[PDB]
Amino acid sequence: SGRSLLELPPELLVEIFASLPGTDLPSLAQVCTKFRRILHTDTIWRRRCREEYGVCENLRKLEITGVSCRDVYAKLLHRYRHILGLWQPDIGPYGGLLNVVVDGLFIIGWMYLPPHDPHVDDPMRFKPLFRIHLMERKAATVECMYGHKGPHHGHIQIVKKDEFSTKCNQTDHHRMSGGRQEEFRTWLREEWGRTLEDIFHEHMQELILMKFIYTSQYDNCLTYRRIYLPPSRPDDLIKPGLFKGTYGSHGLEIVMLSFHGRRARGTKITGDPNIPAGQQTVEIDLRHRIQLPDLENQRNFNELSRIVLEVRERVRQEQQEGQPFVLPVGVSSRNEDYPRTCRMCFYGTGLIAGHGFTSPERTPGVFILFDEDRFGFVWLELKSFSLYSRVQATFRNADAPSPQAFDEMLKNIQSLTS
């Protein structure tokens, strides 16, 4: 009988408003005097920031900086919501990994790079590429973080749900007193932990230079496309996500493992001029296990080849109508510290192509599972072994909406480099 919303005591109104999506609060504020006044109350906004974007703001920080959670929600978090998440830059065939993330009164674009070849078990390296900073009484600023000469002015541009780009406006900061050579020597130290000497020999010297020159022509003016981490699944899985992998002379590349029924897929997150970022590097057939012999038979390469080509044949028929481990003799492995015990093996195929991604093709191989987060692929026709190891880092905002959204994402990044 009679009572209205407007008669509830403030504390109660605050509790109700505090439970709503922050996007409903602005309508509420325009309803009347009283609601506008009540919606100043920062607790409401501090909660909206916590639940919707995972950020707890420090109260002491807020007091010092003179910024409020209302400000944060309106001018940082909502304003830039579409660039948050996990991204792959469009850099010819090389790709990349950017996780764009909230930290306090900042939004940070973190670039994740692999460790030095061949140390696939070492942690990912990570420098910041750009940040977005909110200060009192102004719009958040956008700064490019690339270079060695500190934060400076940048621009962000949101094109779509699933694409954005960055411009740097004072590239003078990416330069160095000892010139492009030092830029190169520096980049070489971070990416390789080696000098011009250890690389001048030789086919990798060339590939490494081309990469430096090619990627650095972007001066951090870069377009990013959305990627997602893969769906987890219980019985029907043995554990998806990003891995660091050896790709011969190209060094390590980042490769995403994902499950799709009785097949696992390895999708390139970074790549090279032979098989670019976005492509299917590897496809594991999970209904064709391969029994592991004793060490002495594992050593025999031709036994392994005969066995693998057998399975390839039986597969072509179908479609048409842990113990000690050792690589066979004559199979190269950049790593050498590959585990000497494994839990199981499966038939699979890998994608190969000549320079320029020319005439790609599937070659047979065998996938080797060591432990929950280390696996391998023997490239049969190249007598070569790739050793993969899980990226331990944790990623914020990177989950897919659904399994079909993921599958869709895979098809977009593949087509981009097709």
């Binding site: 011969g248 002379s249 032979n274 994608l351 320079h355 190249l382």
Partner: peptide
């Protein structure tokens, strides 16, 4: 090493 064609991966 089998650089003769390892690059194709």
């Amino acid at each position: 090493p089998t650089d003769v064609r390892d690059v194709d991966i």
